[PDB]
Structure 1
Amino acid sequence: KFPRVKNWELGSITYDTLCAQSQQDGPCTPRRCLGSLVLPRPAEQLLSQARDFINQYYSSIKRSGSQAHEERLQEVEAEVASTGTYHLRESELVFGAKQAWRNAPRCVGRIQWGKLQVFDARDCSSAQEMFTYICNHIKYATNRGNLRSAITVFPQRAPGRGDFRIWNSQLVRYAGYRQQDGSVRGDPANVEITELCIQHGWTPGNGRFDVLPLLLQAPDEAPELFVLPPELVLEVPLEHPTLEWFAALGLRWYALPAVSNMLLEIGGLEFSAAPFSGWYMSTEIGTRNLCDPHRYNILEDVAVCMDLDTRTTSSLWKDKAAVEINLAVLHSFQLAKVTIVDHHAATVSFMKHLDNEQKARGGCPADWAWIVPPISGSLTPVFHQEMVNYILSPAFRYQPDPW
């Protein structure tokens, strides 16, 4: 039985046959669905993942069964049999990184998947060198506000030694300073990394939007601290198109979302440090980062400024303030000429993506809870779209924190 996938707004039906290509189990069983959980609840092994990936590559370039194909499978085989591991060619790495993005079920931005700048940093041997590559990535991806998706791939995990890691969860994160009275100044999501930085010798600030240094770690060495040059970190002050007091809130966000703690897996090889970046969808900032109760939690402040009745849920004060805050983000990014996409445009392009992928591959792995935006869910076409979630490789995965 292959899944029947229905769109409830349009009445149309497709069948996902791509899910038969999945080789890794998810969290669900017949007895119970664990779909809403955030985190996951030998040589022959490597060799079959490696061959499968080599097959994916030669098929993508329309050279399946070529002499080039047969000989590359022999190289991979020879190298695994002798050494227990193998190495990718740059062109395979490029193909693999794009496929890992294509395959990411939680990503609404996958219409863009073919357009990814891949920096090969596999010749990196020190934390100092990782920093140089990271600075070049930021400069390239930022591009004065005309954002360009990029990934930098540092050296693969190797059976002997420690991993290359970027300890920070993103390349740009704001500090979170825990008070003696438990409360937090700045971003509560970043309390632990903030403390790690101070402990490794960073002189901390005391503002709401202090940009953290990077803790970069080469194998089996303590991490090293590197402050990002302020000119490399583009930020956008937040103002509202009609509410004058909104700028008085002193709010800002950074332009460049760059995730730096996920493991990249290609053909059985694992890249423990492979930071990737694109551009933001406005609800990430406007709704989650600014309005989550465990984040900057600004809903009440904005509601009061708007003079809303805060004493009762049924005035929909939270909803009204969230909308204005999202509007402010979109407005302020647009005024700063910094790439951003609203949740309506983003979900519409994802629907087009689902259709491209249906034709190209016979399905598309998608995690409904992550694709539907955190405000105005049913106002976007993705709410009414059934989705099938499953794990294809190449993949981005979670990995343990290195401390």
Structure 2
Amino acid sequence: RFLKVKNWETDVVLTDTLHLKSTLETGCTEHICMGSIMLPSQHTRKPEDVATKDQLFPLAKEFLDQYYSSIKRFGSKAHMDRLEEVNKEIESTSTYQLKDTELIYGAKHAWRNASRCVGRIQWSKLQVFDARDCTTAHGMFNYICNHVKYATNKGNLRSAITIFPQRTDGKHDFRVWNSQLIRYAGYKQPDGSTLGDPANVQFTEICIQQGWKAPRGRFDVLPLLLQANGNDPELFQIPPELVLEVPIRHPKFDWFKDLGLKWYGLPAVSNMLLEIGGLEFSACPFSGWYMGTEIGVRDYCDNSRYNILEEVAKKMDLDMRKTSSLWKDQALVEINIAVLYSFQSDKVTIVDHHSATESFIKHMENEYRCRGGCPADWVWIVPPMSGSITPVFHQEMLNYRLTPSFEYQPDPWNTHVW
């Protein structure tokens, strides 16, 4: 009931007691482990799972008890009256509203509890933008531009989240239909192949079906498609001066510029759902900075993404006949050297997978010491390249689900009553 986790590189043992406070389920049973299912049935919030008023107060109490425990005023009159006040408000409204202080605590701890995030060492330095007074898609557009400009900070990137009004009935739902705020377009070709980013080919067409005029090229920054209070979503173009991009060059290979690759500086997930004290925030774009491998390995070299191992090994002139020449591996390392070098020489914040995984072990030690545990998903924490030469490969990690949390949710174009 007080489980142990070992680092087999260092023989370090940590003791997890935090998992006891866990409430959500994981998908695994005593007889089957689901730790490699990408979007487990549990990790999703459908708009039908509107917690009724009966369900709402325990969730509200539980969250309020840890918040007041966090500010060392647990059990005081202030806690008791806030407990009573929200109880009364859930009676009256069948929902309730978070204080600004409770919203910042909730948001920071959803990040803190994100077992799949390797960058959590920074969880307490997060800038919370309260957009719960927003009412229109134009207002959403304005909040989001302000978020991008703030978080980008001229390349000195700053973590942030913008929180739009919470779900109520489920049919009046604020949603950012983009999966990230800044993404490159993807166009299918007349010959079947794909221009830009194959991930977004359906989303790119949805923007055109709603009227987007596509420059039909590679790295075309998509428009924001914003839905407000359940209304049909409307297209907006982020001012280009607000979208900071890094041209990718290599510190040895001068032919690397002619590849003509670039990437945006700001990773800003926009499709997920923030859950706090039983309330569901369907639109909550949050941004940080990139770990290099996200761009260099997954974005650039996933078979179904930009898939550039081909041309890079070509220009490196590699033994591309044999599978066992590791030409793929060889081109992958050079590509990721280039991503880091470009961002750093341009003063845009980026972290390499070695520094990031070291910081997460260090972060893990802090959580087990001053919190009693740290939920962690090894399948996601280990970087997609050079796994065992980073310290997180050798670290045992207990995965469990704590609230407040970030959840996945259906893409809005499958649930929307147009």
CA apart distance, 1:114: 0.6
Q: Are 2:29 and 1:34 equivalent residues in the alignment? A: no
CA apart distance, 1:21: 0.8
CA apart distance, 1:207: 1.1
Q: Are 2:64 and 1:59 equivalent residues in the alignment? A: no
What pairs up with 1:32-111 in 2 under 5 angstroms?
32-41=32-41, 42-111=52-121
TM-score by length of 1: 0.99
Q: Indicate the residue corresponding to 1:137 in structure 2.
A: 147
Structure 1: any 5+ residue segments left out of the alignment? none
What pairs up with 1:148-159 in 2 under 5 angstroms?
148-159=158-169
Q: Indicate the residue corresponding to 1:258 in structure 2.
A: 268
Q: Are 2:209 and 1:199 equivalent residues in the alignment? A: yes
* Cα distance in 2 between the residues matched to 1:275 and 1:293: 27
* Cα distance in 1 between the residues matched to 2:402 and 2:208: 39
Superimposed CA distance per residue, residues 185-238 of structure 1 (whole angstroms, 9 cap, x where no aligned partner):
100011111011001000011211000001000123110000111000000000
CA apart distance, 1:17: 1.1
1:388 is paired with a residue of what secondary structure?
coil
| Counterpart AA for 1:53 | F
1:155 is paired with a residue of what secondary structure?
coil
CA apart distance, 1:399: 0.5
The correspondence for 1:164, drawn from 174, 178, 190, is 174
Q: Are 2:389 and 1:379 equivalent residues in the alignment? A: yes
The correspondence for 1:128, drawn from 124, 138, 158, is 138
Superimposed CA distance per residue, residues 3-30 of structure 1 (whole angstroms, 9 cap, x where no aligned partner):
2211111112222111111111111111
Q: Is the 8 A contact 2:158 2:288 kept in 1?
A: yes
What pairs up with 1:230-249 in 2 under 5 angstroms?
230-249=240-259
Superposition RMSD on alpha carbons, in Å?
0.9
Q: Indicate the residue corresponding to 1:346 in structure 2.
A: 356
Q: Indicate the residue corresponding to 1:331 in structure 2.
A: 341
CA apart distance, 1:160: 5.9
| Counterpart AA for 2:134 | C
| Counterpart AA for 2:349 | T
| Counterpart AA for 1:272 | S
Superimposed CA distance per residue, residues 40-70 of structure 1 (whole angstroms, 9 cap, x where no aligned partner):
2332321111001111111111111111111
Q: Indicate the residue corresponding to 1:2 in structure 2.
A: 2
TM-score by length of 2: 0.95
* Cα distance in 2 between the residues matched to 1:186 and 1:99: 35
Structure 2: any 5+ residue segments left out of the alignment? 42-51, 414-418
Q: Indicate the residue corresponding to 1:13 in structure 2.
A: 13
Aligned length: 403
1:382 is paired with a residue of what secondary structure?
coil
| Counterpart AA for 1:130 | M
| Counterpart AA for 1:25 | E
1:242 is paired with a residue of what secondary structure?
coil
Q: Is the 8 A contact 2:14 2:365 kept in 1?
A: no
* Cα distance in 2 between the residues matched to 1:75 and 1:181: 63
* Cα distance in 2 between the residues matched to 1:121 and 1:220: 16
Q: Are 2:285 and 1:272 equivalent residues in the alignment? A: no
2:392 is paired with a residue of what secondary structure?
helix
Greater shift, 337-346 or 51-60, is seen at: 51-60
* Cα distance in 1 between the residues matched to 2:373 and 2:60: 23
Q: Percent identity?
A: 68
Q: Is the 8 A contact 2:319 2:325 kept in 1?
A: yes
CA apart distance, 1:258: 0.4
Q: Is the 8 A contact 2:125 2:159 kept in 1?
A: yes
1:24 is paired with a residue of what secondary structure?
coil
